Design a protein around this ligand. Structure first.
Ligand SMILES: [Ca+2]
Length: 188
């Protein structure tokens, strides 16, 4: 919890924070064509289903990369415009112990490592290599859930648990201060 070194934020199932890719070298409107994505974070949970993170514009047509707990295991999913790929971890996540997650994508190639497992790798189908996004990022849940009807129920399920030390594209997130949607703040 935010009361001893690492500030850990609690998520109650309705909690979700919006952030914007506000840190650089990791104008006006338009979009971004990202070659890569890098996510690192630690979570603590008893949940067997839940959306951890969603990066993308959040429209039905939009590209996305997301982390979710699906049937007790963290998985990464992304669709860059040539259909999605899923990378599924082998580490039970719902132990209620702080667990590290490292997930990244370079063009079509993805990697997911929970704890000390051998990284799970895979690639989205040949074609698109860039994630077209406005830079929006949601943690613990999502505003626009309709863009989850095409996915496992976990993606429409708010995360219940705690999160700390979130690093997005080489920048440590200030979970409380960086949040843009005035969420209800609770510590772990
Ligand atoms: Ca794309």
């Amino acid at each position: 919890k935010a009361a001893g070194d690492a500030e850990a934020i609690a998520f109650d199932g309705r909690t979700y924070m919006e952030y914007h890719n506000a840190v650089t070298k990791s104008a006006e409107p338009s979009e971004k064509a990202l070659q890569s994505n890098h996510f690192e974070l630690s979570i603590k949970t008893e949940a067997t289903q839940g959306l951890i993170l969603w990066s993308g514009k959040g429209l039905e047509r939009s590209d996305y990369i997301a982390l979710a707990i699906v049937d007790g295991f963290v998985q990464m999913m992304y669709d860059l415009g040539s259909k999605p790929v899923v990378l599924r971890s082998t580490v039970p996540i719902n132990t209620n112990h702080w667990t590290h997650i490292k997930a990244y994508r370079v063009q079509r190639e993805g990697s997911l490592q929970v704890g000390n497992e051998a990284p799970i790798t895979g690639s989205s189908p040949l074609g698109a290599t860039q994630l077209d996004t406005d830079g929006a990022l949601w943690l613990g849940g999502m505003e626009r859930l309709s863009v989850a009807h095409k996915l496992p129920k976990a993606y429409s399920t708010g995360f219940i648990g705690c999160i700390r030390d979130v690093i997005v594209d080489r920048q440590e997130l200030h979970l409380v201060e960086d949040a843009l949607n005035n969420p209800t703040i609770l510590h772990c």
